[PDB]
Amino acid sequence: RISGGNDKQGFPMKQGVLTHGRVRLLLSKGHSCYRPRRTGERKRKSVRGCIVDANLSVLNLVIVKKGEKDIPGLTDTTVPRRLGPKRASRIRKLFNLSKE
Amino acid sequence: ARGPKKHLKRVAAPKHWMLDKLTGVFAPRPSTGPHKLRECLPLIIFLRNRLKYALTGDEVKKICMQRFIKIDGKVRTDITYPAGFMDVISIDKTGENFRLIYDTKGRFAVHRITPEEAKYKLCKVRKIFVGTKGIPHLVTHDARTIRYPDPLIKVNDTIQIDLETGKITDFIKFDTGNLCMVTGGANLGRIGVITNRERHPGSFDVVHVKDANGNSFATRLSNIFVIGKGNKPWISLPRGKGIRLTIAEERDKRLAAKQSSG
Amino acid sequence: KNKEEAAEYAKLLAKRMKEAKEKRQEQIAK
Amino acid sequence: ADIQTERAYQKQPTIFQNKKRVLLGETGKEKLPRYYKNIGLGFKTPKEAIEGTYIDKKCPFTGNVSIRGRILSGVVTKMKMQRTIVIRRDYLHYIRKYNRFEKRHKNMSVHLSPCFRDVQIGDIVTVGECRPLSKTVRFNVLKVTKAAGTK
Amino acid sequence: GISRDNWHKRRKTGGKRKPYHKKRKYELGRPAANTKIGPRRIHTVRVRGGNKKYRALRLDVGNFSWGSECCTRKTRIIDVVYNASNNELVRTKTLVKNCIVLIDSTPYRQWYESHYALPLGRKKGAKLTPEEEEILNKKRSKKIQKKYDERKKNAKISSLLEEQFQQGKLLACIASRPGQCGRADGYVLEGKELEFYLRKIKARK
RNA sequence: AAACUGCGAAUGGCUCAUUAAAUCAGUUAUGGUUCCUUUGGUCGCUCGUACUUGGAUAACUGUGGUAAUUCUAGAGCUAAUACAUGCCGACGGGCGCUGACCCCCUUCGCGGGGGGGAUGCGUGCAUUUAUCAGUGGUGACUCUAGAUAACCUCGGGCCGAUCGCACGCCCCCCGUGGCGGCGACGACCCAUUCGAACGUCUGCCCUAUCAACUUUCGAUGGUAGUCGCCGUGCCUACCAUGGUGACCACGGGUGACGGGGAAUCAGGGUUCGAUUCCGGAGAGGGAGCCUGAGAAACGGCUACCACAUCCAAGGAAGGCAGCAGGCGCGCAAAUU
RNA sequence: CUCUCGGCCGAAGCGUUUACUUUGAAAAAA
Ligand SMILES: [Mg+2]
Ligand SMILES: [Mg+2]
Ligand SMILES: [Mg+2]
Ligand SMILES: [Mg+2]
Ligand SMILES: [Mg+2]
Ligand SMILES: [Mg+2]
Ligand SMILES: [Mg+2]
Ligand SMILES: [Mg+2]
Ligand SMILES: [Mg+2]
Ligand SMILES: [Mg+2]
Ligand SMILES: [Mg+2]
Ligand SMILES: [Mg+2]
Ligand SMILES: [Mg+2]
Ligand SMILES: [Mg+2]
Ligand SMILES: [Mg+2]
Ligand SMILES: [Mg+2]
Ligand SMILES: [Mg+2]
Ligand SMILES: [Mg+2]
Ligand SMILES: [Mg+2]
Ligand SMILES: [Mg+2]
Ligand SMILES: [Mg+2]
Ligand SMILES: [Mg+2]
Ligand SMILES: [Mg+2]
Ligand SMILES: [Mg+2]
Ligand SMILES: [Mg+2]
Ligand SMILES: [Mg+2]
Ligand SMILES: [Mg+2]
Ligand SMILES: [Mg+2]
Ligand SMILES: [Mg+2]
Ligand SMILES: [Mg+2]
Ligand SMILES: [Mg+2]
Ligand SMILES: [Mg+2]
Ligand SMILES: [Mg+2]
Ligand SMILES: [Mg+2]
Ligand SMILES: [Mg+2]
Ligand SMILES: [Mg+2]
Ligand SMILES: [Mg+2]
């Protein structure tokens, strides 16, 4: 799956814009590729379009379906440990606990 | 300005705080509260300038954060809290009680009272209105709203409130012959008996007052606070009974006191 | 608190109305 | 008929004139109850306001206005606008250096209610202050007294 | 933006004045809410103090009152017929305060037939449905019939309202401001005002 | 520690360019508006999973792009007083209408009365409109309160799924155990405090080699609306022809921010007030906005105009009339 | 100053109205 990427000038790709090149957008809170410094602040930023072209420095990919073999760097590694649920209802849902 | 102001220049502060000019550029701006900015006394001014308990503003905060000061029976930790007329200040650590009463010079005085007297205060009725479900409401001069007041109580009257429960015990009607104190103007701090009231529709009313010595003066109706019924006050009075002396007789009293000193 | 205050004011209002009406009746009769 | 001269219906907002009634009470008289009020400060309501049939929302007696503020006086000088006249107020301004005075005047555009009729140029008018009724009008005519030459 | 100040205006004498400050936030104005007739669409506006104004953009129903009968009911809005301020508002079918509109008559007819138990708005052909027959010709006892017969003494309506009920649509006037509160409320025209507006509408044609 | 959340950043400090009934001063009004916070009052007043409901996101761990920024992209986890959703209880009823049926008087009887009533709809405070009667208040309400018929916005009013400290009394009991004290936070609506914003009356320096001005593009008033937090040509449509002026209108100038005040002065007066206090305005010049209770904010954003910084030429970043300090200017003014 | 109505005074009209003068009230500090 095509997640995103950066073009040769380092600008990120946004999902909405349907172009092969860069555009300038007025971005506010709730938009990707931007992080406001003040409440209600908006800023004009340059963003690369979503259509994949040959002028990309890096392209991001996410594996969704596994194939016959497993890549030595990606798949064969053991899964790492991670934090467990913190809310009680999520604990019950994970461990199939009843009210008792 | 684009919004509310938060500072107060020292020279622009009320002149009855008796602040000096060279201590600093700023004065304690009173917080919002029961009393107006120009008609209150901040807690810090009373705690370090009047009583000399603290030397700086930091020591006032150190005293207040120990929950030693009570205003009208409730602990206040704010050092700029607006304390006003007929308020009770209690310090249980030293066992002291004070009531804020104007002296004849128009300044709040350090007036100590009995702990028995510190259980009640007098309030002036500012508004009477009927609310939802036909319930009467009474609003005093210190922003207290009381439900179900006595039907005979009208505006410009005085009520006695018990500070523990916040309920009316009795009241004094605004009539000629009662005792009153002036709370604003040129006659601020004077005590006397009401002689007559002049009504001016569409404008301010004028009330004439005569003191014990027989001196007469006049004020607006908004500057009058009924203290007692007839000649008997319902609160304790400061050293001066509300009689304003002339400069000549103040000089005479001072010279007599100096001559008898030593 | 609501019930107690309502009852107390009802008693006080009955007292006040009775007193006022009695005084008016005394004024009229005389 | 004579009252209805605008594109919109002219009515007193606080009076309900569509109350249904029996056929016996309809024959008697179609007399709308008039809305009027006492403005206070000792001014009396003209009988033409109580018994009249005009519609004026800016009238001090039958309209939605409130009289509060200053009470002033003037002399009528122009009556050429609709329900509003121009009066002149004369006074003397003191000049400290010469210990003397100079004559000055001001002009006021004030609202005149239809209840006041037979108002001529040169008679005294007592006006009261109200909320801004237009760009330049802030006063309403309260009393009219005739000139000294009245016969 | 849109400013509703007073210092851009000429003086009473006629001379123009030079401003001493720029446009302020508290002097702003906003574009008009041209309310049409259609499926409901209302937008909220954040106004001074943090309060809300409901900006009605499309409305089709509202509650109107029959004052003589004191019967307030919620009815749909059909058409705009007259507008005192401007006739362009009638052509574009804009809902503003004091505009004359046509509303449905069915709820008022239902209340009238359920209260006085008399026909209203029916054709002379006397065609009927059993539900209406049992609404009007129900079997009532002596006491209830005594109340209904007494109510039948006051059951009388002017010819203008009766003809409007026959047509199926009533003439009403809007008393609320749709662009400010988001709803179109009003009252049914009757009496001298109804005659005045009928004459105005006929003269306009 | 970090990060999410909350609050403040609209105060203070600087300067005097604009500005001549404008600002400003005294005096009044808001019965024509909004108001964070503090203080007080309300907060079982509604009759219709709860022993606690849902999905995500940072900080963190890992993979990266660009010469360059307080630039950020993908992937793996996890919280709430963030974001959402939603009950029980009080809840027994009461009151307004609809009212099958059941009684009690008078009547020979019809008829004239007086009650009880099952079944249905509605219900509290705020919101919008119409009608009715006349607790408390004002000099004066179209005030406050009451009654009736409805409405009540999905870009949605309230009616607590929050936190801390001390912990105890009660029962046919050991439980679904029931009850309870102080606070913190939040919230609809009144009142208060701090204000702000529009209005009333009077008051300002020279100039006629400025004597008529305003009204096409609102100038003066009327009617109905729109917009606005409210009153109003604030704006719109249709109408009337108005409004101001030798008592100096209109125009022009000012090395004009206005006062509290300063210098000189027998008594009058003349000149000054950029400058520490109170109001106003501005942030290189204009204009337009987001957030917020409050800004047309500039140590916030977006453009144009004039300047101007880095660049790998693809881009990125600007506002000292804040404290020092530097250049220029000048007769003229201090420590990075 | 004036009748009336209420407890000599209280309400209400005053003054044909101003100018003037003498009081009183409200009038930021510095
Ligand atoms: Mg400032
Ligand atoms: Mg403070
Ligand atoms: Mg002289
Ligand atoms: Mg300016
Ligand atoms: Mg933060
Ligand atoms: Mg803030
Ligand atoms: Mg400084
Ligand atoms: Mg002023
Ligand atoms: Mg207003
Ligand atoms: Mg508040
Ligand atoms: Mg993620
Ligand atoms: Mg929340
Ligand atoms: Mg009401
Ligand atoms: Mg209007
Ligand atoms: Mg108009
Ligand atoms: Mg200048
Ligand atoms: Mg000057
Ligand atoms: Mg001299
Ligand atoms: Mg000399
Ligand atoms: Mg000065
Ligand atoms: Mg100055
Ligand atoms: Mg200069
Ligand atoms: Mg200043
Ligand atoms: Mg500014
Ligand atoms: Mg600057
Ligand atoms: Mg500069
Ligand atoms: Mg700029
Ligand atoms: Mg805020
Ligand atoms: Mg700006
Ligand atoms: Mg700066
Ligand atoms: Mg700033
Ligand atoms: Mg500097
Ligand atoms: Mg610098
Ligand atoms: Mg020098
Ligand atoms: Mg030099
Ligand atoms: Mg002063
Ligand atoms: Mg002074």
Side-chain angles (χ1 to χ4, degrees), chain B residues 11 21 185 187 218 220 223:
Chain B
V11 80
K21 65 174 60 182
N187 301 282
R220 287 185 181 177
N223 292 330

PDB file of all heavy atoms in Angstrom, chain B residues 11 21 185 187 218 220 223, chain G residues 24-30:
ATOM      1  N   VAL B  11       0.227  56.360  42.228  1.00  0.00           N
ATOM      2  CA  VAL B  11      -0.325  57.700  42.373  1.00  0.00           C
ATOM      3  C   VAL B  11      -1.792  57.758  41.963  1.00  0.00           C
ATOM      4  O   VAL B  11      -2.498  58.698  42.345  1.00  0.00           O
ATOM      5  CB  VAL B  11       0.508  58.713  41.568  1.00  0.00           C
ATOM      6  CG1 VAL B  11       0.140  58.666  40.099  1.00  0.00           C
ATOM      7  CG2 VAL B  11       0.345  60.117  42.132  1.00  0.00           C
ATOM      8  N   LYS B  21       4.638  57.967  48.077  1.00  0.00           N
ATOM      9  CA  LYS B  21       4.928  58.082  46.651  1.00  0.00           C
ATOM     10  C   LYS B  21       6.184  57.318  46.239  1.00  0.00           C
ATOM     11  O   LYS B  21       6.242  56.782  45.128  1.00  0.00           O
ATOM     12  CB  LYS B  21       5.048  59.555  46.255  1.00  0.00           C
ATOM     13  CG  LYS B  21       6.216  60.292  46.878  1.00  0.00           C
ATOM     14  CD  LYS B  21       6.340  61.698  46.325  1.00  0.00           C
ATOM     15  CE  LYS B  21       5.093  62.517  46.600  1.00  0.00           C
ATOM     16  NZ  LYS B  21       5.197  63.882  46.018  1.00  0.00           N
ATOM     17  N   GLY B 185     -18.727  60.989  49.442  1.00  0.00           N
ATOM     18  CA  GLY B 185     -18.811  62.416  49.233  1.00  0.00           C
ATOM     19  C   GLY B 185     -17.909  63.201  50.167  1.00  0.00           C
ATOM     20  O   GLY B 185     -16.923  62.697  50.707  1.00  0.00           O
ATOM     21  N   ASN B 187     -18.925  64.547  53.053  1.00  0.00           N
ATOM     22  CA  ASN B 187     -19.278  64.270  54.437  1.00  0.00           C
ATOM     23  C   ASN B 187     -19.033  62.816  54.817  1.00  0.00           C
ATOM     24  O   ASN B 187     -19.593  62.340  55.809  1.00  0.00           O
ATOM     25  CB  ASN B 187     -20.738  64.643  54.697  1.00  0.00           C
ATOM     26  CG  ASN B 187     -21.023  66.103  54.431  1.00  0.00           C
ATOM     27  OD1 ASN B 187     -20.705  66.967  55.247  1.00  0.00           O
ATOM     28  ND2 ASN B 187     -21.628  66.389  53.287  1.00  0.00           N
ATOM     29  N   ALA B 218     -25.776  67.855  54.268  1.00  0.00           N
ATOM     30  CA  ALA B 218     -26.643  67.185  53.313  1.00  0.00           C
ATOM     31  C   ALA B 218     -25.810  66.293  52.408  1.00  0.00           C
ATOM     32  O   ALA B 218     -24.634  66.561  52.160  1.00  0.00           O
ATOM     33  CB  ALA B 218     -27.439  68.187  52.468  1.00  0.00           C
ATOM     34  N   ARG B 220     -26.368  62.987  49.054  1.00  0.00           N
ATOM     35  CA  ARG B 220     -27.289  62.280  48.182  1.00  0.00           C
ATOM     36  C   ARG B 220     -27.823  61.037  48.886  1.00  0.00           C
ATOM     37  O   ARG B 220     -27.243  60.543  49.855  1.00  0.00           O
ATOM     38  CB  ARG B 220     -26.611  61.895  46.869  1.00  0.00           C
ATOM     39  CG  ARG B 220     -26.380  63.061  45.928  1.00  0.00           C
ATOM     40  CD  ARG B 220     -25.810  62.586  44.605  1.00  0.00           C
ATOM     41  NE  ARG B 220     -25.564  63.688  43.682  1.00  0.00           N
ATOM     42  CZ  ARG B 220     -25.013  63.544  42.482  1.00  0.00           C
ATOM     43  NH1 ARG B 220     -24.650  62.341  42.060  1.00  0.00           N
ATOM     44  NH2 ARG B 220     -24.823  64.599  41.704  1.00  0.00           N
ATOM     45  N   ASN B 223     -25.572  57.880  49.321  1.00  0.00           N
ATOM     46  CA  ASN B 223     -24.432  57.939  50.225  1.00  0.00           C
ATOM     47  C   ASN B 223     -24.815  57.757  51.689  1.00  0.00           C
ATOM     48  O   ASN B 223     -23.989  58.024  52.566  1.00  0.00           O
ATOM     49  CB  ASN B 223     -23.693  59.270  50.058  1.00  0.00           C
ATOM     50  CG  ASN B 223     -23.011  59.393  48.715  1.00  0.00           C
ATOM     51  OD1 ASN B 223     -22.595  58.401  48.123  1.00  0.00           O
ATOM     52  ND2 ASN B 223     -22.889  60.621  48.228  1.00  0.00           N
TER      53      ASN B 223
ATOM     54  P     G G  24     -22.291  76.385  51.835  1.00  0.00           P
ATOM     55  OP1   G G  24     -21.657  76.259  53.170  1.00  0.00           O
ATOM     56  OP2   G G  24     -21.484  76.870  50.689  1.00  0.00           O
ATOM     57  O5'   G G  24     -22.916  74.977  51.445  1.00  0.00           O
ATOM     58  C5'   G G  24     -24.003  74.445  52.183  1.00  0.00           C
ATOM     59  C4'   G G  24     -24.823  73.488  51.358  1.00  0.00           C
ATOM     60  O4'   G G  24     -25.522  74.202  50.310  1.00  0.00           O
ATOM     61  C3'   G G  24     -24.053  72.415  50.613  1.00  0.00           C
ATOM     62  O3'   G G  24     -23.670  71.336  51.447  1.00  0.00           O
ATOM     63  C2'   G G  24     -25.024  72.018  49.508  1.00  0.00           C
ATOM     64  O2'   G G  24     -26.011  71.128  50.005  1.00  0.00           O
ATOM     65  C1'   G G  24     -25.701  73.352  49.197  1.00  0.00           C
ATOM     66  N9    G G  24     -25.176  74.001  47.981  1.00  0.00           N
ATOM     67  C8    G G  24     -24.407  75.133  47.868  1.00  0.00           C
ATOM     68  N7    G G  24     -24.137  75.442  46.628  1.00  0.00           N
ATOM     69  C5    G G  24     -24.770  74.461  45.878  1.00  0.00           C
ATOM     70  C6    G G  24     -24.839  74.255  44.476  1.00  0.00           C
ATOM     71  O6    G G  24     -24.340  74.925  43.566  1.00  0.00           O
ATOM     72  N1    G G  24     -25.590  73.130  44.158  1.00  0.00           N
ATOM     73  C2    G G  24     -26.197  72.308  45.069  1.00  0.00           C
ATOM     74  N2    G G  24     -26.883  71.265  44.593  1.00  0.00           N
ATOM     75  N3    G G  24     -26.139  72.486  46.372  1.00  0.00           N
ATOM     76  C4    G G  24     -25.415  73.571  46.702  1.00  0.00           C
ATOM     77  P     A G  25     -22.349  70.486  51.114  1.00  0.00           P
ATOM     78  OP1   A G  25     -22.057  69.639  52.296  1.00  0.00           O
ATOM     79  OP2   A G  25     -21.310  71.410  50.591  1.00  0.00           O
ATOM     80  O5'   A G  25     -22.802  69.532  49.922  1.00  0.00           O
ATOM     81  C5'   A G  25     -23.950  68.711  50.055  1.00  0.00           C
ATOM     82  C4'   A G  25     -24.377  68.128  48.733  1.00  0.00           C
ATOM     83  O4'   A G  25     -24.781  69.179  47.826  1.00  0.00           O
ATOM     84  C3'   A G  25     -23.312  67.366  47.966  1.00  0.00           C
ATOM     85  O3'   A G  25     -23.157  66.048  48.460  1.00  0.00           O
ATOM     86  C2'   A G  25     -23.822  67.425  46.528  1.00  0.00           C
ATOM     87  O2'   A G  25     -24.795  66.417  46.303  1.00  0.00           O
ATOM     88  C1'   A G  25     -24.527  68.784  46.496  1.00  0.00           C
ATOM     89  N9    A G  25     -23.765  69.847  45.810  1.00  0.00           N
ATOM     90  C8    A G  25     -23.121  70.917  46.374  1.00  0.00           C
ATOM     91  N7    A G  25     -22.561  71.719  45.503  1.00  0.00           N
ATOM     92  C5    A G  25     -22.869  71.148  44.279  1.00  0.00           C
ATOM     93  C6    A G  25     -22.565  71.519  42.959  1.00  0.00           C
ATOM     94  N6    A G  25     -21.853  72.600  42.637  1.00  0.00           N
ATOM     95  N1    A G  25     -23.024  70.732  41.965  1.00  0.00           N
ATOM     96  C2    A G  25     -23.737  69.648  42.283  1.00  0.00           C
ATOM     97  N3    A G  25     -24.091  69.198  43.484  1.00  0.00           N
ATOM     98  C4    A G  25     -23.620  70.002  44.452  1.00  0.00           C
ATOM     99  P     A G  26     -21.929  65.130  47.987  1.00  0.00           P
ATOM    100  OP1   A G  26     -21.889  63.953  48.887  1.00  0.00           O
ATOM    101  OP2   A G  26     -20.727  65.990  47.848  1.00  0.00           O
ATOM    102  O5'   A G  26     -22.369  64.621  46.544  1.00  0.00           O
ATOM    103  C5'   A G  26     -21.500  63.819  45.763  1.00  0.00           C
ATOM    104  C4'   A G  26     -21.458  64.282  44.330  1.00  0.00           C
ATOM    105  O4'   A G  26     -21.957  65.639  44.228  1.00  0.00           O
ATOM    106  C3'   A G  26     -20.079  64.352  43.701  1.00  0.00           C
ATOM    107  O3'   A G  26     -19.612  63.089  43.267  1.00  0.00           O
ATOM    108  C2'   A G  26     -20.276  65.355  42.572  1.00  0.00           C
ATOM    109  O2'   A G  26     -20.899  64.735  41.457  1.00  0.00           O
ATOM    110  C1'   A G  26     -21.273  66.327  43.201  1.00  0.00           C
ATOM    111  N9    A G  26     -20.627  67.522  43.780  1.00  0.00           N
ATOM    112  C8    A G  26     -20.394  67.779  45.107  1.00  0.00           C
ATOM    113  N7    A G  26     -19.820  68.935  45.332  1.00  0.00           N
ATOM    114  C5    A G  26     -19.669  69.483  44.068  1.00  0.00           C
ATOM    115  C6    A G  26     -19.121  70.699  43.630  1.00  0.00           C
ATOM    116  N6    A G  26     -18.609  71.618  44.448  1.00  0.00           N
ATOM    117  N1    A G  26     -19.120  70.944  42.303  1.00  0.00           N
ATOM    118  C2    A G  26     -19.635  70.020  41.484  1.00  0.00           C
ATOM    119  N3    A G  26     -20.175  68.841  41.777  1.00  0.00           N
ATOM    120  C4    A G  26     -20.163  68.626  43.103  1.00  0.00           C
ATOM    121  P     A G  27     -18.379  62.390  44.018  1.00  0.00           P
ATOM    122  OP1   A G  27     -18.649  60.933  44.093  1.00  0.00           O
ATOM    123  OP2   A G  27     -18.112  63.153  45.261  1.00  0.00           O
ATOM    124  O5'   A G  27     -17.152  62.626  43.034  1.00  0.00           O
ATOM    125  C5'   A G  27     -16.357  63.797  43.137  1.00  0.00           C
ATOM    126  C4'   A G  27     -16.597  64.737  41.984  1.00  0.00           C
ATOM    127  O4'   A G  27     -17.226  65.939  42.476  1.00  0.00           O
ATOM    128  C3'   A G  27     -15.354  65.228  41.256  1.00  0.00           C
ATOM    129  O3'   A G  27     -14.943  64.324  40.243  1.00  0.00           O
ATOM    130  C2'   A G  27     -15.781  66.581  40.691  1.00  0.00           C
ATOM    131  O2'   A G  27     -16.413  66.425  39.430  1.00  0.00           O
ATOM    132  C1'   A G  27     -16.828  67.047  41.706  1.00  0.00           C
ATOM    133  N9    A G  27     -16.359  68.115  42.609  1.00  0.00           N
ATOM    134  C8    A G  27     -16.255  68.068  43.976  1.00  0.00           C
ATOM    135  N7    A G  27     -15.837  69.187  44.514  1.00  0.00           N
ATOM    136  C5    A G  27     -15.668  70.031  43.428  1.00  0.00           C
ATOM    137  C6    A G  27     -15.245  71.365  43.327  1.00  0.00           C
ATOM    138  N6    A G  27     -14.903  72.110  44.377  1.00  0.00           N
ATOM    139  N1    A G  27     -15.187  71.918  42.097  1.00  0.00           N
ATOM    140  C2    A G  27     -15.535  71.169  41.044  1.00  0.00           C
ATOM    141  N3    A G  27     -15.949  69.906  41.012  1.00  0.00           N
ATOM    142  C4    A G  27     -15.994  69.389  42.250  1.00  0.00           C
ATOM    143  P     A G  28     -13.851  63.187  40.540  1.00  0.00           P
ATOM    144  OP1   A G  28     -14.268  61.953  39.829  1.00  0.00           O
ATOM    145  OP2   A G  28     -13.602  63.134  42.001  1.00  0.00           O
ATOM    146  O5'   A G  28     -12.533  63.736  39.839  1.00  0.00           O
ATOM    147  C5'   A G  28     -11.437  64.188  40.615  1.00  0.00           C
ATOM    148  C4'   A G  28     -10.630  63.027  41.135  1.00  0.00           C
ATOM    149  O4'   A G  28     -10.294  62.137  40.045  1.00  0.00           O
ATOM    150  C3'   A G  28      -9.295  63.382  41.762  1.00  0.00           C
ATOM    151  O3'   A G  28      -9.436  63.778  43.114  1.00  0.00           O
ATOM    152  C2'   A G  28      -8.488  62.106  41.580  1.00  0.00           C
ATOM    153  O2'   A G  28      -8.841  61.152  42.569  1.00  0.00           O
ATOM    154  C1'   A G  28      -9.007  61.602  40.235  1.00  0.00           C
ATOM    155  N9    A G  28      -8.170  62.028  39.100  1.00  0.00           N
ATOM    156  C8    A G  28      -8.456  63.022  38.202  1.00  0.00           C
ATOM    157  N7    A G  28      -7.546  63.179  37.278  1.00  0.00           N
ATOM    158  C5    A G  28      -6.599  62.215  37.580  1.00  0.00           C
ATOM    159  C6    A G  28      -5.386  61.869  36.969  1.00  0.00           C
ATOM    160  N6    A G  28      -4.908  62.483  35.885  1.00  0.00           N
ATOM    161  N1    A G  28      -4.674  60.864  37.518  1.00  0.00           N
ATOM    162  C2    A G  28      -5.160  60.256  38.605  1.00  0.00           C
ATOM    163  N3    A G  28      -6.288  60.490  39.267  1.00  0.00           N
ATOM    164  C4    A G  28      -6.971  61.494  38.698  1.00  0.00           C
ATOM    165  P     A G  29      -8.220  64.470  43.895  1.00  0.00           P
ATOM    166  OP1   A G  29      -8.783  65.202  45.054  1.00  0.00           O
ATOM    167  OP2   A G  29      -7.400  65.206  42.903  1.00  0.00           O
ATOM    168  O5'   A G  29      -7.380  63.237  44.452  1.00  0.00           O
ATOM    169  C5'   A G  29      -6.047  63.409  44.902  1.00  0.00           C
ATOM    170  C4'   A G  29      -5.137  62.329  44.377  1.00  0.00           C
ATOM    171  O4'   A G  29      -5.551  61.933  43.044  1.00  0.00           O
ATOM    172  C3'   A G  29      -3.680  62.726  44.209  1.00  0.00           C
ATOM    173  O3'   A G  29      -2.950  62.676  45.420  1.00  0.00           O
ATOM    174  C2'   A G  29      -3.190  61.749  43.151  1.00  0.00           C
ATOM    175  O2'   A G  29      -2.944  60.474  43.723  1.00  0.00           O
ATOM    176  C1'   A G  29      -4.422  61.641  42.252  1.00  0.00           C
ATOM    177  N9    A G  29      -4.378  62.608  41.140  1.00  0.00           N
ATOM    178  C8    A G  29      -5.325  63.553  40.848  1.00  0.00           C
ATOM    179  N7    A G  29      -5.040  64.289  39.807  1.00  0.00           N
ATOM    180  C5    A G  29      -3.821  63.794  39.377  1.00  0.00           C
ATOM    181  C6    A G  29      -2.987  64.156  38.306  1.00  0.00           C
ATOM    182  N6    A G  29      -3.269  65.135  37.446  1.00  0.00           N
ATOM    183  N1    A G  29      -1.835  63.474  38.146  1.00  0.00           N
ATOM    184  C2    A G  29      -1.554  62.493  39.008  1.00  0.00           C
ATOM    185  N3    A G  29      -2.257  62.062  40.051  1.00  0.00           N
ATOM    186  C4    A G  29      -3.397  62.757  40.185  1.00  0.00           C
ATOM    187  P     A G  30      -2.260  64.006  45.997  1.00  0.00           P
ATOM    188  OP1   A G  30      -1.676  63.700  47.323  1.00  0.00           O
ATOM    189  OP2   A G  30      -3.235  65.113  45.875  1.00  0.00           O
ATOM    190  O5'   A G  30      -1.063  64.287  44.987  1.00  0.00           O
ATOM    191  C5'   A G  30      -0.053  63.315  44.767  1.00  0.00           C
ATOM    192  C4'   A G  30       0.727  63.604  43.510  1.00  0.00           C
ATOM    193  O4'   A G  30      -0.137  63.469  42.351  1.00  0.00           O
ATOM    194  C3'   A G  30       1.294  65.007  43.381  1.00  0.00           C
ATOM    195  O3'   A G  30       2.497  65.192  44.106  1.00  0.00           O
ATOM    196  C2'   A G  30       1.458  65.154  41.877  1.00  0.00           C
ATOM    197  O2'   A G  30       2.603  64.450  41.427  1.00  0.00           O
ATOM    198  C1'   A G  30       0.217  64.424  41.374  1.00  0.00           C
ATOM    199  N9    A G  30      -0.915  65.350  41.200  1.00  0.00           N
ATOM    200  C8    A G  30      -2.115  65.346  41.860  1.00  0.00           C
ATOM    201  N7    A G  30      -2.922  66.307  41.493  1.00  0.00           N
ATOM    202  C5    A G  30      -2.204  66.995  40.525  1.00  0.00           C
ATOM    203  C6    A G  30      -2.503  68.125  39.744  1.00  0.00           C
ATOM    204  N6    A G  30      -3.655  68.794  39.809  1.00  0.00           N
ATOM    205  N1    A G  30      -1.564  68.551  38.877  1.00  0.00           N
ATOM    206  C2    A G  30      -0.406  67.887  38.805  1.00  0.00           C
ATOM    207  N3    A G  30      -0.009  66.817  39.483  1.00  0.00           N
ATOM    208  C4    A G  30      -0.965  66.416  40.338  1.00  0.00           C
TER     209        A G  30
END
